Each structure stands twice: as C-alpha cells, then as structure tokens.
Design a protein around this ligand. Structure first.
Ligand SMILES: Nc1ncccc1CO
Length: 330
C-alpha cells in the first residue's frame, strides 16, 4: 500500500504545516501537524476542556463506530518548546492520503497548553519519530508509520514541504518526479528516539564550505533551523545590522536586508536554503526588525534541522531495519 497527502502552511510565514487525516467511522477529518520530533498522535476532542478549545475541529469518539477506549491508558507530553498536552486514549481507524491503519492509538486531549489553544488551524499532531518516544502509559503505543510499515510497498515516508506553498507527505514510495538530481542517504542514530544524523558542514552565501560534523535531528515540528552558536554567528555576521537580541529571544535583522543563502552538507552533497527562506518577518506588526530563521541551539542541547532546512529538500525518512535519511534538492 501507499498514501499521499498534501500538507499546507498554516500562515504566510510557514510557521507549521497541516495535513488532513481521517479518523473513525464515519470519517472525522482533522488537520494535523505531522511531527518528525514526537511519537504521539493526539487530537483536540470532545473531551478537551472547553475553555482550551478555540476554533479547532474536534474528534468525538462516541460518534465513531470503530472507536474503542484503551482502558487505563493515559498520555502526557512536554515538548522542547514548553508546550504540553495530556489525556486518555482510544484506538480507531486512521487514514492518511488513502493509507489506512486500523487500531491506531488516537490520544484524546483532556488538556492542552495555551499555544495549542491559540493555534485554531492545528487540530492535533501526528508523531513520526520513533515509537520509543511515545508517551502512552502503562503500555507504550506505536506511531502511525510504525503501524503502517509492514503494509507499505517500501518502509519509508517522504516530506516535501513547500516554501509559501503546499507540499506533500508520501508513505510507502519515493516519487522520483518530486526532486532533482539524486538522493544522498546518510546514517541515522535512533538512540534518542529521533531522526538524528550528522551534517558534513556548511557555507554562508557564496562563501567557502566549512567541513565540520554537525549532529542534529530532522524535526518538521520545529519552524526554524537551530545550529551551534559559532555557525549562527558566522551566518548573521554577513547581514548588515543583524544582532542577537536577548529581549526578542534570538537574532533579528533589518527588514530591508537581503539575506544570504545557507548551505548544509549531506555527505558529499549540498542542500542550499535560499536567503528568503530565512526571513520570518517583523518581530511585531509594523516593526522594521525581522526575526531570523537560523538561530542558536546553545540553549536547547541539540541541533534541529526544522522546517527552514527541510523545506529546501526532498527528504526521505527510511524506516528499514537500519533507518537512514535521504536528502535531494528540488
Ligand atoms: N517538534 C515539536 N512538536 C511539538 C511541539 C514542539 C516541537 C518542537 O519544539
């Protein structure tokens, strides 16, 4: 089997992407934020505290003839940005782009933090990291991809995120028309439960490539690209007027600037992030200070190849017995 679904930016900055997902019988379609950085599929629901729902579409398990309460199971997740949600668990049929999984754990939110309430466009998250990170207790549950894997034509999914445009998540096949050149594969460590790999270096604009190992994760749930302070300082030093602002929370730059590209290495291959992709717009409405899309990881503990980086590539998440990541230009 295969599946293919369009993913759409939630706003004009590509802050996140939503993909329609069919849950239950008859189908309830919710727009979920496919997340390479977590292993829980959770949804706003008829159980979510009413004051914490503000425009999201909810899953109502009592209206699904295939929903079953997973007795005793609870979940609670705290994400790297300080957001959180928790609740109980149903199993139900979940379909993405024509690919159907029966008995998928659907984690129903009883509580969500303010940033989840304030995003009316995101009805939940569909985790695509390794199932070892799933938070369901006392019996950890499998991700949608893990459940679908055996049925797929090939045990892979691909992320083709658009710049200010829709893109595609495919399951079970590699669309050879969706990228240019060849796909370069690189080793993955699953020891932390993430799609963790090592970039071979970077360049700023037309500058020379610096060969240096940069360990990080391929996280489509992070908006930005978080890299070591040395790398980030070298990037922003090429933008007149750019500075790190403690009050704003990162590097900012004059909105009148033209940003240089940023290149990252994948083995001997190179992925070029155009400068435009690094512009996240005014820090507040009407400001001439703009927020940068490349930021320091120094306070995180891990480097993060988020949407800024991934949207410049066609990315293969290869879930073979020894997982690997593939990157192609497009
Ligand atoms: N990947 C993620 N998923 C959900 C919330 C936050 C992040 C990243 O900070």
């Amino acid at each position: 089997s295969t599946g293919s679904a369009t993913t759409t930016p939630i706003d004009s900055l590509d802050d996140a992407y939503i993909t329609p997902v069919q849950i239950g019988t008859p189908a309830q379609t919710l727009n979920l934020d496919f997340d390479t950085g977590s292993s829980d599929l959770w949804v706003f629901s008829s159980e979510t505290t009413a004051s914490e729902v503000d425009g999201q579409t909810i899953y109502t398990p009592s209206k699904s003839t295939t929903a079953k309460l997973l007795s005793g199971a609870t979940w609670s997740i705290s994400y790297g940005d300080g957001s959180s949600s928790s609740g109980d668990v149903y199993t139900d049929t979940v379909s993405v782009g024509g690919l159907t999984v029966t008995g998928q754990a659907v984690e129903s939110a009883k509580k969500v933090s303010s940033s989840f309430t304030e995003d009316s466009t995101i009805d939940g998250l569909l985790g695509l990291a390794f199932s070892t990170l799933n938070t369901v207790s006392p019996t950890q549950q499998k991700t949608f991809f893990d459940n679908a894997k055996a049925s797929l034509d090939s045990p892979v999914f691909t992320a083709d995120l658009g710049y200010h445009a829709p893109g595609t998540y495919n399951f079970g096949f590699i669309d050879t028309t969706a990228y240019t050149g060849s796909i370069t594969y690189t080793a993955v460590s699953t020891k932390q439960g993430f799609w963790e790999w090592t970039s071979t270096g970077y360049a700023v604009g037309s500058g020379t490539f610096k060969s240096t190992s940069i360990d990080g994760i391929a996280d489509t749930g992070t908006t930005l690209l978080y890299l070591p302070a040395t790398v980030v300082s070298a990037y922003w030093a090429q933008v007149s007027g750019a500075k790190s602002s403690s009050s704003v929370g990162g590097y900012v730059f004059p909105c009148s600037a033209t940003l240089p590209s940023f290149t990252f290495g994948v083995g001997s291959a190179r992925i070029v992030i155009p400068g435009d992709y690094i512009d996240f717009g005014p820090i507040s409405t009407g400001s001439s200070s703009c927020f940068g899309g490349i930021q320091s990881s120094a306070g995180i503990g891990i480097n993060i190849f988020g949407d800024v980086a991934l949207k410049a590539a066609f990315v293969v998440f290869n879930g073979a017995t020894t997982p690997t990541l593939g990157f192609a230009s497009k």
